[PDB]
Structure 1
Amino acid sequence: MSKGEELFTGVVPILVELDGDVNGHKFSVSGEGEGDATYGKLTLKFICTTGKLPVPWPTLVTTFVQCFARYPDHMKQHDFFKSAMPEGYVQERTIFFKDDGNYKTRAEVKFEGDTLVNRIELKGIDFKEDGNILGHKLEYNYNSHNVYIMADKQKNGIKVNFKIRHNIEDGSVQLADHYQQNTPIGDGPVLLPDNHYLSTQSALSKDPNEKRDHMVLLEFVTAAGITKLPFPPDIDPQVFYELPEEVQKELMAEWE
Protein backbone atom coordinates (compact mmCIF):
# COMPACT_ATOMS: atom_id res chain seq x y z
CA MET A 1 0.00 0.00 0.00
CA SER A 2 2.95 2.36 0.35
CA LYS A 3 6.67 2.25 -0.58
CA GLY A 4 7.51 3.35 2.97
CA GLU A 5 5.85 0.12 4.17
CA GLU A 6 8.83 -1.79 2.65
CA LEU A 7 11.29 -0.12 5.02
CA PHE A 8 9.60 -1.86 7.99
CA THR A 9 9.52 -5.56 6.98
CA GLY A 10 12.51 -6.43 9.22
CA VAL A 11 14.02 -5.22 12.46
CA VAL A 12 14.93 -1.55 12.23
CA PRO A 13 17.45 0.18 14.55
CA ILE A 14 16.14 3.26 16.38
CA LEU A 15 17.79 6.32 17.92
CA VAL A 16 15.88 8.80 20.12
CA GLU A 17 17.18 12.23 21.25
CA LEU A 18 15.20 14.55 23.52
CA ASP A 19 15.90 18.04 24.78
CA GLY A 20 13.60 19.04 27.55
CA ASP A 21 12.84 21.96 29.76
CA VAL A 22 10.10 21.56 32.41
CA ASN A 23 9.44 24.55 34.64
CA GLY A 24 12.92 25.75 33.61
CA HIS A 25 14.59 22.50 34.68
CA LYS A 26 16.67 21.46 31.68
CA PHE A 27 17.49 17.85 30.79
CA SER A 28 18.49 15.66 27.84
CA VAL A 29 17.77 11.98 27.14
CA SER A 30 19.28 9.66 24.57
CA GLY A 31 17.73 6.34 23.64
CA GLU A 32 18.44 3.42 21.40
CA GLY A 33 16.87 0.11 20.41
CA GLU A 34 14.88 -1.45 17.63
CA GLY A 35 11.42 -1.85 16.18
CA ASP A 36 9.73 -4.81 14.45
CA ALA A 37 6.49 -3.72 12.81
CA THR A 38 5.71 -7.26 11.67
CA TYR A 39 5.02 -8.00 15.33
CA GLY A 40 4.16 -4.46 16.38
CA LYS A 41 7.04 -4.58 18.89
CA LEU A 42 9.31 -1.76 20.04
CA THR A 43 12.22 -2.13 22.48
CA LEU A 44 14.12 0.98 23.68
CA LYS A 45 16.54 1.95 26.46
CA PHE A 46 16.87 5.58 27.51
CA ILE A 47 19.51 7.31 29.61
CA CYS A 48 19.27 10.81 31.11
CA THR A 49 22.63 12.28 29.97
CA THR A 50 22.35 15.41 32.06
CA GLY A 51 22.04 13.87 35.57
CA LYS A 52 18.72 12.90 37.21
CA LEU A 53 15.55 13.27 35.23
CA PRO A 54 13.34 16.04 36.85
CA VAL A 55 10.04 14.39 35.89
CA PRO A 56 8.92 10.75 36.18
CA TRP A 57 10.07 8.43 33.37
CA PRO A 58 6.51 7.21 32.67
CA THR A 59 5.42 10.80 31.75
CA LEU A 60 7.81 10.67 28.79
CA VAL A 61 6.81 7.25 27.34
CA THR A 62 4.41 8.65 24.75
CA THR A 63 6.98 11.26 23.64
CA PHE A 64 9.82 8.74 23.22
CA VAL A 65 7.54 6.02 16.75
CA GLN A 66 4.04 4.84 15.71
CA CYS A 67 5.45 3.70 12.35
CA PHE A 68 6.22 0.47 14.27
CA ALA A 69 2.55 -0.40 14.78
CA ARG A 70 1.38 -3.64 13.27
CA TYR A 71 -1.36 -2.89 10.75
CA PRO A 72 -3.39 -5.98 9.76
CA ASP A 73 -3.43 -6.68 6.01
CA HIS A 74 -6.99 -5.40 5.67
CA MET A 75 -5.90 -2.06 7.20
CA LYS A 76 -2.63 -1.41 5.34
CA GLN A 77 -4.21 1.40 3.30
CA HIS A 78 -4.74 3.32 6.61
CA ASP A 79 -1.11 3.40 7.78
CA PHE A 80 -0.10 7.06 7.51
CA PHE A 81 3.08 6.65 9.55
CA LYS A 82 4.94 4.24 7.28
CA SER A 83 3.66 6.01 4.15
CA ALA A 84 5.52 9.17 5.13
CA MET A 85 8.84 7.30 5.17
CA PRO A 86 11.73 7.64 4.58
CA GLU A 87 11.43 11.43 4.59
CA GLY A 88 9.31 11.18 7.70
CA TYR A 89 6.82 13.20 9.64
CA VAL A 90 6.58 15.90 12.23
CA GLN A 91 4.70 14.79 15.37
CA GLU A 92 3.47 17.61 17.64
CA ARG A 93 1.57 17.21 20.88
CA THR A 94 0.11 19.08 23.74
CA ILE A 95 -0.29 16.89 26.86
CA PHE A 96 -2.35 18.02 29.83
CA PHE A 97 -1.78 16.49 33.21
CA LYS A 98 -5.06 16.80 35.16
CA ASP A 99 -4.70 19.37 37.94
CA ASP A 100 -1.11 20.01 36.98
CA GLY A 101 1.06 21.32 34.15
CA ASN A 102 1.38 20.58 30.48
CA TYR A 103 3.95 19.43 27.95
CA LYS A 104 4.30 20.79 24.44
CA THR A 105 6.43 18.61 22.09
CA ARG A 106 7.69 18.73 18.57
CA ALA A 107 9.41 15.73 17.04
CA GLU A 108 10.80 14.75 13.69
CA VAL A 109 10.63 11.03 12.95
CA LYS A 110 12.58 10.03 9.87
CA PHE A 111 15.20 7.67 8.45
CA GLU A 112 18.85 8.72 8.76
CA GLY A 113 20.47 6.00 6.66
CA ASP A 114 19.05 2.70 7.85
CA THR A 115 18.20 4.00 11.35
CA LEU A 116 14.79 5.39 12.31
CA VAL A 117 15.43 8.54 14.38
CA ASN A 118 13.02 10.34 16.69
CA ARG A 119 14.42 13.84 17.50
CA ILE A 120 12.27 15.69 20.08
CA GLU A 121 12.05 19.12 21.77
CA LEU A 122 9.80 19.26 24.83
CA LYS A 123 8.75 22.27 26.93
CA GLY A 124 6.72 21.81 30.12
CA ILE A 125 5.08 24.66 32.02
CA ASP A 126 2.80 25.30 35.04
CA PHE A 127 3.80 22.24 37.04
CA LYS A 128 3.16 22.23 40.77
CA GLU A 129 6.32 21.92 42.80
CA ASP A 130 5.02 19.11 45.01
CA GLY A 131 2.41 17.75 42.56
CA ASN A 132 2.63 14.22 41.18
CA ILE A 133 5.04 15.02 38.40
CA LEU A 134 7.71 17.29 39.97
CA GLY A 135 7.18 15.37 43.24
CA HIS A 136 7.91 11.97 41.61
CA LYS A 137 4.74 10.36 42.94
CA LEU A 138 4.02 8.21 39.87
CA GLU A 139 4.51 4.44 40.01
CA TYR A 140 7.15 3.05 37.64
CA ASN A 141 4.70 1.27 35.40
CA TYR A 142 2.32 1.69 32.49
CA ASN A 143 -1.14 0.58 31.36
CA SER A 144 -2.90 -0.18 28.06
CA HIS A 145 -4.54 2.51 25.95
CA ASN A 146 -6.35 3.06 22.67
CA VAL A 147 -4.87 5.73 20.47
CA TYR A 148 -7.59 7.25 18.23
CA ILE A 149 -6.56 8.38 14.73
CA MET A 150 -8.45 10.54 12.24
CA ALA A 151 -7.50 12.12 8.95
CA ASP A 152 -6.76 15.84 8.73
CA LYS A 153 -7.08 16.38 4.98
CA GLN A 154 -6.44 20.14 5.11
CA LYS A 155 -3.04 19.51 6.66
CA ASN A 156 -2.36 16.38 4.56
CA GLY A 157 -1.89 14.50 7.84
CA ILE A 158 -3.67 13.07 10.88
CA LYS A 159 -4.94 14.18 14.27
CA VAL A 160 -4.63 11.75 17.18
CA ASN A 161 -6.25 11.75 20.65
CA PHE A 162 -6.03 9.57 23.73
CA LYS A 163 -5.87 9.75 27.52
CA ILE A 164 -3.09 8.09 29.52
CA ARG A 165 -3.77 6.66 33.02
CA HIS A 166 -0.68 7.08 35.22
CA ASN A 167 -0.91 5.12 38.48
CA ILE A 168 0.05 7.13 41.60
CA GLU A 169 1.87 5.55 44.54
CA ASP A 170 -1.07 6.35 46.90
CA GLY A 171 -3.50 4.35 44.71
CA SER A 172 -4.98 7.24 42.76
CA VAL A 173 -4.67 7.76 38.98
CA GLN A 174 -3.27 10.85 37.23
CA LEU A 175 -4.73 11.41 33.74
CA ALA A 176 -2.68 12.88 30.86
CA ASP A 177 -4.88 14.07 27.93
CA HIS A 178 -2.93 13.96 24.61
CA TYR A 179 -3.66 16.09 21.53
CA GLN A 180 -1.48 15.07 18.70
CA GLN A 181 -0.96 15.98 15.02
CA ASN A 182 1.33 14.48 12.36
CA THR A 183 2.26 15.92 9.00
CA PRO A 184 4.67 14.66 6.32
CA ILE A 185 8.12 16.20 5.99
CA GLY A 186 8.46 15.22 2.31
CA ASP A 187 6.34 15.92 -0.73
CA GLY A 188 5.53 12.33 -1.76
CA PRO A 189 2.03 10.84 -1.36
CA VAL A 190 0.87 9.69 2.04
CA LEU A 191 -2.06 7.59 3.15
CA LEU A 192 -4.81 9.48 4.91
CA PRO A 193 -6.75 6.98 6.95
CA ASP A 194 -10.34 6.30 7.86
CA ASN A 195 -10.98 6.59 11.66
CA HIS A 196 -9.33 3.75 13.55
CA TYR A 197 -7.15 3.22 16.61
CA LEU A 198 -3.94 1.68 17.82
CA SER A 199 -4.22 -0.72 20.74
CA THR A 200 -1.06 0.13 22.71
CA GLN A 201 0.52 -1.72 25.63
CA SER A 202 3.79 -0.84 27.39
CA ALA A 203 5.96 -2.19 30.13
CA LEU A 204 8.84 -0.40 31.89
CA SER A 205 11.84 -1.98 33.45
CA LYS A 206 15.35 -1.34 34.72
CA ASP A 207 18.81 -2.62 33.93
CA PRO A 208 20.21 -3.54 37.39
CA ASN A 209 23.76 -2.88 36.10
CA GLU A 210 22.96 0.59 34.78
CA LYS A 211 23.72 3.15 37.42
CA ARG A 212 22.74 6.17 35.26
CA ASP A 213 19.08 7.33 35.55
CA HIS A 214 17.39 5.33 32.79
CA MET A 215 14.30 3.50 31.49
CA VAL A 216 13.90 0.27 29.54
CA LEU A 217 10.64 0.39 27.50
CA LEU A 218 8.81 -2.44 25.67
CA GLU A 219 5.75 -1.54 23.62
CA PHE A 220 3.29 -3.67 21.63
CA VAL A 221 1.11 -1.82 19.15
CA THR A 222 -1.57 -3.18 16.82
CA ALA A 223 -4.04 -1.20 14.67
CA ALA A 224 -7.75 -1.97 14.89
CA GLY A 225 -11.23 -0.54 14.50
CA ILE A 226 -11.83 -1.25 10.79
CA THR A 227 -13.36 -4.75 10.22
CA LYS A 228 -7.00 26.28 32.36
CA LEU A 229 -8.67 24.69 29.26
CA PRO A 230 -6.64 22.50 26.91
CA PHE A 231 -5.04 24.15 23.81
CA PRO A 232 -3.88 22.45 20.58
CA PRO A 233 -0.31 22.25 19.24
CA ASP A 234 -0.75 25.11 16.69
CA ILE A 235 -1.77 27.84 19.13
CA ASP A 236 0.57 29.60 21.58
CA PRO A 237 -1.10 29.13 25.04
CA GLN A 238 -0.49 32.84 25.71
CA VAL A 239 -2.93 33.82 22.85
CA PHE A 240 -5.24 30.95 23.58
CA TYR A 241 -6.12 32.00 27.13
CA GLU A 242 -7.10 35.49 25.87
CA LEU A 243 -9.94 33.92 23.82
CA PRO A 244 -13.46 33.52 25.31
CA GLU A 245 -13.83 30.12 27.12
CA GLU A 246 -16.52 29.21 24.60
CA VAL A 247 -14.05 29.74 21.79
CA GLN A 248 -11.26 27.90 23.64
CA LYS A 249 -13.64 24.92 23.87
CA GLU A 250 -14.82 25.13 20.26
CA LEU A 251 -11.20 25.09 19.01
CA MET A 252 -10.70 21.65 20.56
CA ALA A 253 -13.75 19.84 19.02
CA GLU A 254 -11.73 18.27 16.15
CA TRP A 255 -9.94 15.95 18.55
CA GLU A 256 -13.47 14.55 19.21
Structure 2
Amino acid sequence: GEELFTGVVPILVELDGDVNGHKFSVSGEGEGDATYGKLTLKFICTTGKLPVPWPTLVTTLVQCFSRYPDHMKQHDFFKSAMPEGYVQERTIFFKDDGNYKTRAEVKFEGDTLVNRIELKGIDFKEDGNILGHKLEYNYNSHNVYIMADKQKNGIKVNFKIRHNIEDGSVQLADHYQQNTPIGDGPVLLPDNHYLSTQSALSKDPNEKRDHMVLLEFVTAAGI
Protein backbone atom coordinates (compact mmCIF):
# COMPACT_ATOMS: atom_id res chain seq x y z
CA GLY A 1 0.00 0.00 0.00
CA GLU A 2 2.83 2.41 0.92
CA GLU A 3 4.25 2.54 -2.65
CA LEU A 4 1.08 4.25 -3.92
CA PHE A 5 1.71 7.26 -1.66
CA THR A 6 5.32 8.17 -2.39
CA GLY A 7 4.34 10.97 -4.78
CA VAL A 8 1.60 13.63 -5.11
CA VAL A 9 -1.78 11.89 -5.52
CA PRO A 10 -4.88 13.57 -6.95
CA ILE A 11 -7.99 13.42 -4.76
CA LEU A 12 -11.74 13.53 -5.66
CA VAL A 13 -14.38 13.88 -2.93
CA GLU A 14 -18.13 13.43 -3.57
CA LEU A 15 -20.63 13.86 -0.67
CA ASP A 16 -24.47 13.55 -0.67
CA GLY A 17 -26.11 14.78 2.49
CA ASP A 18 -29.49 15.30 4.12
CA VAL A 19 -29.58 17.26 7.34
CA ASN A 20 -33.10 17.71 8.88
CA GLY A 21 -34.65 17.36 5.45
CA HIS A 22 -32.22 19.76 3.79
CA LYS A 23 -30.60 17.88 0.87
CA PHE A 24 -27.23 18.99 -0.52
CA SER A 25 -24.17 17.73 -2.46
CA VAL A 26 -20.53 18.70 -2.22
CA SER A 27 -17.78 17.94 -4.66
CA GLY A 28 -14.07 18.53 -3.96
CA GLU A 29 -10.77 18.22 -5.82
CA GLY A 30 -7.18 18.59 -4.80
CA GLU A 31 -4.02 16.68 -4.07
CA GLY A 32 -2.39 14.86 -1.17
CA ASP A 33 1.32 14.36 -0.39
CA ALA A 34 1.69 11.75 2.41
CA THR A 35 5.49 12.29 2.50
CA TYR A 36 4.69 15.68 4.22
CA GLY A 37 1.26 14.69 5.56
CA LYS A 38 -0.15 17.51 3.44
CA LEU A 39 -3.59 17.96 1.83
CA THR A 40 -4.71 20.91 -0.37
CA LEU A 41 -8.37 20.75 -1.50
CA LYS A 42 -11.17 22.99 -2.75
CA PHE A 43 -14.80 21.97 -2.07
CA ILE A 44 -17.89 23.42 -3.72
CA CYS A 45 -21.58 23.01 -2.79
CA THR A 46 -22.97 21.93 -6.13
CA THR A 47 -26.63 22.30 -5.07
CA GLY A 48 -26.64 25.97 -4.04
CA LYS A 49 -26.07 27.33 -0.48
CA LEU A 50 -24.71 24.78 2.00
CA PRO A 51 -27.30 24.35 4.75
CA VAL A 52 -24.83 23.68 7.49
CA PRO A 53 -21.58 25.44 8.31
CA TRP A 54 -18.57 24.30 6.28
CA PRO A 55 -16.43 23.64 9.38
CA THR A 56 -18.87 21.00 10.51
CA LEU A 57 -18.02 18.99 7.33
CA VAL A 58 -14.15 19.01 7.44
CA THR A 59 -13.76 15.72 9.32
CA THR A 60 -16.15 13.95 6.95
CA LEU A 61 -14.70 15.39 3.76
CA VAL A 62 -8.74 10.71 3.75
CA GLN A 63 -6.45 9.73 6.60
CA CYS A 64 -4.31 7.57 4.25
CA PHE A 65 -2.54 10.97 3.55
CA SER A 66 -1.20 11.18 7.12
CA ARG A 67 2.55 11.19 7.47
CA TYR A 68 3.68 8.15 9.49
CA PRO A 69 7.30 8.46 10.76
CA ASP A 70 9.58 5.70 9.51
CA HIS A 71 9.69 3.96 12.95
CA MET A 72 5.90 3.75 13.00
CA LYS A 73 5.16 2.59 9.41
CA GLN A 74 3.98 -0.88 10.50
CA HIS A 75 1.10 0.90 12.30
CA ASP A 76 -0.40 2.59 9.19
CA PHE A 77 -3.63 0.72 8.62
CA PHE A 78 -4.89 3.31 6.16
CA LYS A 79 -2.34 2.91 3.41
CA SER A 80 -2.14 -0.88 4.08
CA ALA A 81 -5.77 -1.26 2.87
CA MET A 82 -5.08 0.31 -0.57
CA PRO A 83 -5.76 0.22 -3.46
CA GLU A 84 -8.94 -1.78 -2.71
CA GLY A 85 -9.71 0.72 0.00
CA TYR A 86 -11.61 0.91 3.27
CA VAL A 87 -15.05 1.76 4.59
CA GLN A 88 -15.12 4.64 7.04
CA GLU A 89 -18.20 5.08 9.19
CA ARG A 90 -18.87 7.67 11.90
CA THR A 91 -21.53 9.02 14.29
CA ILE A 92 -20.71 12.63 15.22
CA PHE A 93 -22.65 13.93 18.18
CA PHE A 94 -22.95 17.70 18.42
CA LYS A 95 -23.24 18.58 22.11
CA ASP A 96 -26.72 19.88 22.98
CA ASP A 97 -27.74 19.50 19.33
CA GLY A 98 -28.15 16.88 16.54
CA ASN A 99 -25.88 14.14 15.13
CA TYR A 100 -24.43 13.20 11.76
CA LYS A 101 -24.07 9.58 10.74
CA THR A 102 -21.71 9.09 7.78
CA ARG A 103 -20.64 6.12 5.64
CA ALA A 104 -17.78 6.57 3.09
CA GLU A 105 -15.72 4.36 0.80
CA VAL A 106 -12.13 5.55 0.25
CA LYS A 107 -10.24 3.83 -2.55
CA PHE A 108 -8.32 4.34 -5.74
CA GLU A 109 -10.12 4.71 -9.08
CA GLY A 110 -7.22 4.51 -11.48
CA ASP A 111 -4.58 6.80 -10.01
CA THR A 112 -7.09 9.08 -8.27
CA LEU A 113 -7.81 8.58 -4.53
CA VAL A 114 -11.59 8.89 -4.16
CA ASN A 115 -13.67 9.53 -0.99
CA ARG A 116 -17.46 8.91 -1.72
CA ILE A 117 -19.62 9.83 1.29
CA GLU A 118 -23.28 9.58 2.29
CA LEU A 119 -24.22 11.83 5.28
CA LYS A 120 -27.48 11.90 7.24
CA GLY A 121 -28.04 14.49 10.00
CA ILE A 122 -31.04 14.39 12.38
CA ASP A 123 -32.35 16.12 15.49
CA PHE A 124 -30.69 19.45 14.85
CA LYS A 125 -32.25 22.53 16.55
CA GLU A 126 -33.39 25.09 13.93
CA ASP A 127 -32.08 27.82 16.22
CA GLY A 128 -28.90 25.98 17.26
CA ASN A 129 -25.28 26.71 16.41
CA ILE A 130 -25.38 24.48 13.32
CA LEU A 131 -28.64 25.24 11.52
CA GLY A 132 -28.38 28.81 12.78
CA HIS A 133 -24.88 29.26 11.30
CA LYS A 134 -23.19 30.52 14.45
CA LEU A 135 -19.80 28.83 13.90
CA GLU A 136 -16.73 30.85 12.97
CA TYR A 137 -14.96 29.99 9.74
CA ASN A 138 -11.72 28.65 11.28
CA TYR A 139 -10.52 25.37 12.68
CA ASN A 140 -8.49 24.10 15.65
CA SER A 141 -5.69 21.47 15.90
CA HIS A 142 -6.81 18.11 17.36
CA ASN A 143 -5.44 14.70 18.33
CA VAL A 144 -7.20 11.67 16.78
CA TYR A 145 -6.83 8.46 18.80
CA ILE A 146 -6.59 5.10 16.99
CA MET A 147 -6.91 1.52 18.43
CA ALA A 148 -7.00 -1.70 16.55
CA ASP A 149 -10.31 -3.60 16.41
CA LYS A 150 -8.85 -7.11 15.92
CA GLN A 151 -12.29 -8.65 15.80
CA LYS A 152 -13.26 -6.81 12.60
CA ASN A 153 -9.79 -6.66 11.09
CA GLY A 154 -10.15 -2.84 11.36
CA ILE A 155 -9.61 0.12 13.67
CA LYS A 156 -11.77 2.15 16.02
CA VAL A 157 -10.99 5.85 16.28
CA ASN A 158 -12.34 8.51 18.62
CA PHE A 159 -11.75 12.22 19.14
CA LYS A 160 -13.49 15.44 20.04
CA ILE A 161 -13.53 18.44 17.65
CA ARG A 162 -13.96 21.88 19.28
CA HIS A 163 -15.76 24.35 16.93
CA ASN A 164 -15.41 28.05 17.86
CA ILE A 165 -18.81 29.83 18.06
CA GLU A 166 -18.98 33.53 17.10
CA ASP A 167 -19.88 34.63 20.75
CA GLY A 168 -16.51 33.17 21.89
CA SER A 169 -17.82 29.89 23.27
CA VAL A 170 -17.13 26.33 21.96
CA GLN A 171 -19.43 23.75 20.23
CA LEU A 172 -18.15 20.17 20.96
CA ALA A 173 -18.54 17.44 18.27
CA ASP A 174 -17.73 13.96 19.69
CA HIS A 175 -16.62 11.61 16.90
CA TYR A 176 -16.93 7.75 17.10
CA GLN A 177 -15.37 6.12 13.99
CA GLN A 178 -14.82 2.58 12.58
CA ASN A 179 -12.80 1.64 9.50
CA THR A 180 -12.81 -1.79 7.88
CA PRO A 181 -11.10 -2.93 4.72
CA ILE A 182 -13.08 -3.43 1.47
CA GLY A 183 -10.76 -6.19 0.22
CA ASP A 184 -10.30 -9.64 1.78
CA GLY A 185 -6.54 -8.90 1.60
CA PRO A 186 -4.37 -8.41 4.65
CA VAL A 187 -4.05 -5.12 6.51
CA LEU A 188 -1.77 -3.78 9.30
CA LEU A 189 -3.44 -3.67 12.73
CA PRO A 190 -1.85 -0.90 14.84
CA ASP A 191 -0.74 -0.44 18.38
CA ASN A 192 -2.51 2.52 20.05
CA HIS A 193 -1.33 5.84 18.67
CA TYR A 194 -2.74 9.17 17.50
CA LEU A 195 -2.69 11.61 14.56
CA SER A 196 -1.94 15.29 15.27
CA THR A 197 -3.95 17.47 12.88
CA GLN A 198 -3.91 21.09 11.89
CA SER A 199 -6.23 22.68 9.30
CA ALA A 200 -6.48 26.22 7.75
CA LEU A 201 -9.72 27.17 5.92
CA SER A 202 -9.77 29.97 3.39
CA LYS A 203 -11.81 31.27 0.43
CA ASP A 204 -11.05 31.67 -3.29
CA PRO A 205 -11.54 35.39 -4.05
CA ASN A 206 -12.74 34.59 -7.58
CA GLU A 207 -15.24 31.95 -6.67
CA LYS A 208 -18.95 32.76 -6.53
CA ARG A 209 -20.19 29.33 -5.54
CA ASP A 210 -20.54 28.40 -1.81
CA HIS A 211 -17.09 26.81 -1.17
CA MET A 212 -14.22 26.12 1.19
CA VAL A 213 -10.44 25.86 0.44
CA LEU A 214 -8.61 23.71 2.90
CA LEU A 215 -4.93 23.20 3.76
CA GLU A 216 -4.25 20.44 6.31
CA PHE A 217 -1.18 18.75 7.85
CA VAL A 218 -1.48 15.45 9.70
CA THR A 219 1.33 13.41 11.26
CA ALA A 220 1.18 10.20 13.35
CA ALA A 221 2.71 10.18 16.84
CA GLY A 222 2.53 8.33 20.15
CA ILE A 223 5.15 5.62 19.59
Settle same-fold status: TM greater than 0.5.
Answer: yes
1:197-248 deviation line (CA, Å, top 9, x unaligned): 00011010000100000000111000000xxxxxxxxxxxxxxxxxxxxxxx
Structure 1 runs of 4+ with >6 Å offset: none
- For 2:47, what is the secondary structure of its paired residue? coil
Determine what percentage of the aligned residue pairs are the same residue.
99
- 1:58-91 per-position Cα deviation (integer Å, ceiling 9, x unaligned): 0000000000000000000000000000000000
Deviation for aligned residue 1:188? 1.0
**Which structure shows the higher strand fraction?**
2
Question: In the alignment, what sits opposite 2:65?
Answer: 68
| CA distance in 1 between partners of 2:184 and 2:93 (Å) | 32
Q: Output the CA distance in 2 between the equivalents of 1:203 and 1:179.
A: 23
> Which one of the candidate residues 132, 151, 167 is aligned to 2:129?
132
Which one of 199, 209, 212 corresponds to residue 209 of structure 2?
Answer: 212
Q: Does 1:81 align with 2:40?
A: no
In the alignment, the residues of structure 1 paired with residue 197 and residue 146 of structure 2 have an alpha-carbon distance, to the nearest angstrom, of: 13
* Alpha-carbon shift at residue 176 of structure 1 (Å): 0.2
- State how far apart, in whole Å, the 1-side matches of 2:37 and 2:97 are: 32
Unaligned stretches of 5+ in structure 2? none
Helix, strand or coil: the match of 1:104? strand
Equivalent residues, number: 222
- 1:10-159 equivalence runs, <5 A: 10-159=7-156
Q: How much has 1:187 moved relative to structure 2? A: 1.2
> Cα RMSD between the aligned structures?
0.3
- Larger helix percent: 1
Q: Secondary structure at the match of 2:55?
A: helix
Determine the C-alpha separation between the residues in 1 that align with 2:61 and 2:78. 15
Unaligned runs of 5+ in 1: 226-256
In structure 2, distance between residues paired with 1:186 and 1:219: 28
Secondary structure of 1:171's match?
Answer: coil
Structure number with bigger Rg = 1
Structure 1: distance between partners of 2:198 and 2:61: 14
Compute the TM-score of the two structures, normalised by the length of structure 2: 0.99
